[PDB]
Amino acid sequence: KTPEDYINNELKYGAHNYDPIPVVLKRAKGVFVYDVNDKRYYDFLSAYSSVNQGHCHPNILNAMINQAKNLTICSRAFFSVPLGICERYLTNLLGYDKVLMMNTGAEANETAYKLCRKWGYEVKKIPENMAKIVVCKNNQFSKVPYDDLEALEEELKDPNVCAFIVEPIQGEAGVIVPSDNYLQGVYDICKKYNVLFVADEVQTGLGRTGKLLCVHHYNVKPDVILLGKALSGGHYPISAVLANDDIMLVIKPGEHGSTYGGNPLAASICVEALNVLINEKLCENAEKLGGPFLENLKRELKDSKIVRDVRGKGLLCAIEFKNELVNVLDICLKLKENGLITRDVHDKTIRLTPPLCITKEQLDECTEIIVKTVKFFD
Amino acid sequence: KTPEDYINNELKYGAHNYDPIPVVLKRAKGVFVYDVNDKRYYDFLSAYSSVNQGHCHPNILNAMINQAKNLTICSRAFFSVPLGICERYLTNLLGYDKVLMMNTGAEANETAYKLCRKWGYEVKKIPENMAKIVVCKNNFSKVPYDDLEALEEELKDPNVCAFIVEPIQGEAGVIVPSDNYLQGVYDICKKYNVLFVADEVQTGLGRTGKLLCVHHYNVKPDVILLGKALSGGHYPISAVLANDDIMLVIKPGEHGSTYGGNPLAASICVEALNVLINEKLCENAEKLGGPFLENLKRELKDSKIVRDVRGKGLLCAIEFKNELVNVLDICLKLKENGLITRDVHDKTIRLTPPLCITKEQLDECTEIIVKTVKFFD
């Protein structure tokens, strides 16, 4: 049918929990997506990093097929061959003793919360019910502003703090990059006060900023890591929590459920999705291309009336606009018209988050698409 | 690489969040799974109904392959072709206006909680943050299951927005309720203007012989929760269905998992339900269900450890006299004799094979089960 026909059919038969950009996608490969009118767009969202490897990577599909022909799910009532293969692979790769595989980012977060508090009770000997998790503003809980070591140290003085969880670059806040020395500060303060340092790398991990873990840029080793998105190359909801035995062994059977966590199909996809990442050296690509791409955009938008900031690390980039001077949803809609799809946060900031297999040449074309579009609104 | 090799390897490199039956599976097809030693077992858990259609159904693989070649995920920042196809397919099949697709059964529960409460506030006009959901014990305020009288006492409360109930309690030990419980739930919910929410994540999609267990009683709940077999075990997929008057209270803004409603799930889901309908697996379960449970009842009638043999369609259980047998040991013995399941509450064994199971296979399994029970007799 037409784009409007699909949209209206969703409005009729589906809950109205989202207000999407009105492009109706049917195909995708690498950096590109194709709508029902056969129009091609540069995808600058990468499904929030799930397709870091590019859309529809054939090597990831092939691992998915090879496994799904043999076994897709048996439930955690029994063991499957592929899970331990994945656990061994991931833990060796990232340098932690153990991993706990789940499906979604929210599941990884809740699992981390529980792990942290149980370690708080069982190891830190925090009195029952008192285990506090500290989190950052715009992320028993407490909040601290992001990129603030004084505020952090003040909270962690409390003996009942079990963990601090922080994203190496805040995504939802609008790609906020902390000062150099922040994460070393976090590492130091958390060590001082015997508090778990949890890095949330669900968005920043797996090549997006140019490293396997954005934390690697700062040569700092968190006590706990949360991964997801790109773990699957977009073929399956897969997420993970990693920690050494002194932390992870606090977890015991009985727990709750969520039957699909650790399933053989996800386990096989995951190993291949990371095999692709590493073998194609996509971390190196994002790291090589990202810095120049951003400097170019800064340069070409410097002295644009409507631009407030241009920021990023590797291929995790964003433009902040002055929303009193432009409608940013309209920028997004014009971006789409000019062949590039993204989304904004907080009606201010546009994510610039292409798959990591993007070329220097493609990034030059995208710079021109973006600059043309910002000029239109000046 | 032996079973023990694989088990110890997971103990070393994986969190100890589970304590599974020590069988290490490498392959599965239809009704059967195969371990690392090439031993064959009847799967009598069906990954808790995810594999109603049988393990590794080739048609579902084909739909997965056909979609994934084209598009697996774009996020809900944009539209995808397959999602609206799945939504129209699902809503037309079960007779509700709208569906909300998600990934896990816990996502469907939380979405349902939030939908129920917002309906409560916007339609029922319950006062500021007073909306109360009622659930059953052994499945906020709680009420005993199959207790028509205590249900009425609770819903009297004008602050109650919903009552959520499974047609058969799975996690409690496959508690089959009395007839006219469900008819009387409907009537009471209609009486006091409370949403009647049926949790069919386990019971739905052919397991009890019907597309929804609630169809046995010709009752139409206000909200349906589906999951598990929605995917044929190929993908985590769940759903909440409701008519427009309820569903329209949901506005854009809240985010869950970027994977809810993705094109790959949407295309897998249409085929999983197609397999279910076209292979008449609901019919197979109703048909084969009754006789299978007949035998077990009469073949274990003088077993001193057997407390009860119950169920509907292919959602069955045998409950044991706990004081007399270690029910985990029965499960391990069952495994020895080539049938795998799990128990619940240390007394009840699930008997839930895929729906494509044959009369001749289920005869084999009845002998396996009776043989095993007699070992502990």
Evaluate whether A77 touches A209 at the Cβ level (below 8 Å). Answer: no
Asked if residue B260 lies in contact with residue B230, where contact means CB atoms within 8 angstroms, the answer is: no
Residues B220 and B58: their CA atoms lie apart, in Å, by 33
For B347, half-sphere exposure in the C-beta direction (CA atoms, 13 angstrom radius) is 17
Dihedral, A294, A339, A169, A301 alpha carbons, nearest 10: 40
DSSP designation for A86: H
The DSSP line for A206-252 is TTTTSSSSGGGGGT---SEEEE-GGGGTTSS--EEEEE-HHHHTT--
Q: Work out the angle at residue A107's Cα, subtended by the Cα atoms of residues A106 and A108, and round it to the nearest 5 degrees.
A: 90
| Phi, psi angle pair for B53, to nearest 5° | -75, 0
- Domain B57-279 annotated CATH 3.40.640.10: yes
Residues 6+ apart with CB under 8 A from A248: A97, A98, A100, A115, B15
Closest partner residue to A79 (CB to CB) among B10, B43, B103 is B10
Contacts of B97 (CB under 8 A, 6+ apart): A13, B91, B242, B243, B244, B247
SS3 content of chain B, % helix, strand, coil (to 5): 40, 20, 40
Enumerate the CATH 3.40.640.10 domain ranges in chain B, comma separated. 57-279
A319 sits in which H/E element: strand A316-321
The sheet that has B306-312: what strands, in order across it?
B306-312, B315-320, B348-351, B343-344
Closest alpha carbon within chain A to B235: A236
Q: Do B74 and A47 touch (CB under 8 A)?
A: yes
Q: Which of B65, B101, B247 sits opposite A65 (nearest CB)?
A: B65
* Beta strand pairing call for B160-165 and B132-136: parallel
Structural contact between residues A214 and A168, judged by C-beta atoms closer than 8 angstroms = yes
Residues of B in contact with A51 (CB under 8 A): 72-73
- Residues B54 and B31: beta-carbon distance below 8 Å: yes
Name which of A327, A287, A289 is nearest A306 in CA terms: A327
Calpha distance A159→B271 (Å, rounded):
54
Question: What does the alpha-carbon distance between residue B118 and residue B124 come to, in Å, rounded to a whole number?
Answer: 9
CB contact under 8 A, B250 and A105: no
Please state the φ and ψ torsions of residue A78, each to the nearest 5 degrees: -135, 170
What is the dihedral sign for C-alpha A339, A343, A346, A347? positive
Residues 6+ apart with CB under 8 A from B372: B330, B333, B334, B337, B339
From the list B296, B339, B319, B314, the residue with the least C-alpha distance to B44 is B339
Q: Where in chain B is CATH 3.90.1150.10?
A: 1-56+280-377
Phi, psi of A142 (to 5 degrees): -140, 155
- Inter-chain touch A341–B23, beta carbons under 8 Å: no
The DSSP H or E segment spanning B350 is: strand B348-351
Which residues, 6+ apart, have CB-to-CB distance to B95 below 8 Å? B220
CA distance A144 to A132: 13
Catalytic residues of B: 140, 199, 228
Residue B216: CA atoms inside 13 Å, Cβ hemisphere, count? 26
Chain A interface test: which of B49, B115, B250, B259 (most A C-beta within 10 Å): B259
C-alpha A75/C-alpha B69 separation (Å) is 27
Return all residues near B198 (Cβ < 8 A) that are at least 6 apart. Answer: B164, B165, B166, B167, B212, B213, B214, B221, B223, B224, B225
Q: Taking the alpha carbons of B3, B5, B6, B12 in that order, is the dihedral positive or negative?
A: positive
How was this model experimentally determined? X-ray
Residues of chain A with CATH 3.40.640.10: 57-280
**Residue A23 three-state SS:** strand
A304: helix, strand or coil: coil
Q: Do A103 and B98 touch (CB under 8 A)?
A: no
Side chain identity at residue B213, one-letter code: C
For helices A360-377 and A328-337, the axis angle rounded to 10 degrees is 130
Name the residue of chain A whose CA is nearest to B240's CA: A15
Q: What are phi and psi of B339, to 5 degrees?
A: -140, 120
Give every CB contact of residue B116 below 8 A, 6+ residues apart in sequence.
Answer: B131, B133, B161, B162, B164, B195, B197, B223
Determine the residue type at B182: L
The Cα A348–Cα A329 span in angstroms is 9
Distance from C-alpha of B24 to C-alpha of A283, rounded to nearest angstrom: 35
**DSSP for residue B214:** G
Q: Which residues of chain A are in CATH 3.90.1150.10 domains?
A: 1-56+281-378
CB within 8 Å of A220: residues ≥ 6 apart = A183, A184, A186, A187
Distance CA B178, CA A53 (A): 54
Query: Cβ separation of B74 and A16 shorter than 8 Å?
Result: no
Round to whole Å and give the CA distance between B1 and B36: 8
CA–CA gap between residue A373 and residue A5 (Å, rounded): 28
Cβ distance A66 to B97 under 8 Å? no
Contacts of A255 in chain B (CB under 8 A): 17-18
Neighbours of A272 (CB within 10 A): 23
What radius of gyration, in Å, describes the C-alpha atoms of chain B?
21
Q: Token pair of B340, please?
A: 């795998």
**CA A293/CA A373 separation, integer angstroms:** 17
Under 8 Å between Cβ of B367 and B360: no
The token pair at B39 is 């031993």
The CA distance from B352 to B90, in Å, is: 24
Contact present, B173 and B200 (Cβ < 8 Å): no
Q: Using CA atoms, how far apart are residues A129 and A132, in angstroms rounded to an integer? A: 9
Please answer whether residues A317 and A45 qualify as being in contact, where contact means their C-beta atoms are separated by less than 8 angstroms: no
CA dihedral B45, B49, B53, B56 (to 10 degrees): -70
Phi/psi of residue A43, nearest 5 degrees: -80, 110
Q: Which residues pair with A161 in a beta bridge?
A: A132
Angstroms from B70 CA to nearest CA on chain A: 5
**Rg of chain A's alpha carbons, rounded to an integer?**
21
Select from A80, A99, A115 the residue whose CB has the most chain B CBs within 10 Å, as the one to mutate to test that interface: A80
A157-177 burial, b if ≥16 CB within 10 A, otherwise e?
eeeebbbbbbbbbbbebbbbb
Which chain B residues are within 8 Å of A6, Cβ to Cβ?
79, 81, 84
Q: What share of chain A is helix, strand, coil (3-state, %, to 5)?
A: 40, 20, 40
Contact B3, B335 (CB under 8 A): no
**CA dist., res. A102 & res. B269, Å (int):** 21
So what's the architecture of A1-56+281-378 in CATH?
A: Alpha-Beta Complex (3.90)
CB contact under 8 A, B78 and A265: no
Q: Which residues of A touch B70 (CB under 8 A)?
A: 26-28, 56
Judge: B25–A71 Cβ closer than 8 Å, yes or no. yes
Q: Check: CB of residue B113 under 8 Å from CB of residue B107.
A: no
CB-CB neighbors (< 8 A) of B78 in chain A: 20-21, 23-25, 33, 45, 341
Element (H, E) at B270: helix B263-278
Distance CA B52, CA B355 (A): 5
Class of domain B1-56+280-377 as given by CATH: alpha beta
**CATH annotation of A57-280:** 3.40.640.10
Resolution (A): 2.1
B-chain CB neighbours of A101 within 8 Å are 14
Q: State the angle between helix axes of A81-94 and B3-13 in degrees (0 to 180), rounded to the nearest 10.
A: 40
Tokens of A203: 């968005």
Alpha-carbon gap, residue B173 to A301, rounded angstroms? 65
Query: How many alpha carbons fall within 13 Å on the CB side of residue A217?
Result: 26
Residue B59 burial class via C-beta count within 10 angstroms: exposed 0-12, middle 13-18, buried 19 and up:
middle
How far is residue A230 CA from its own chain's centroid? 7
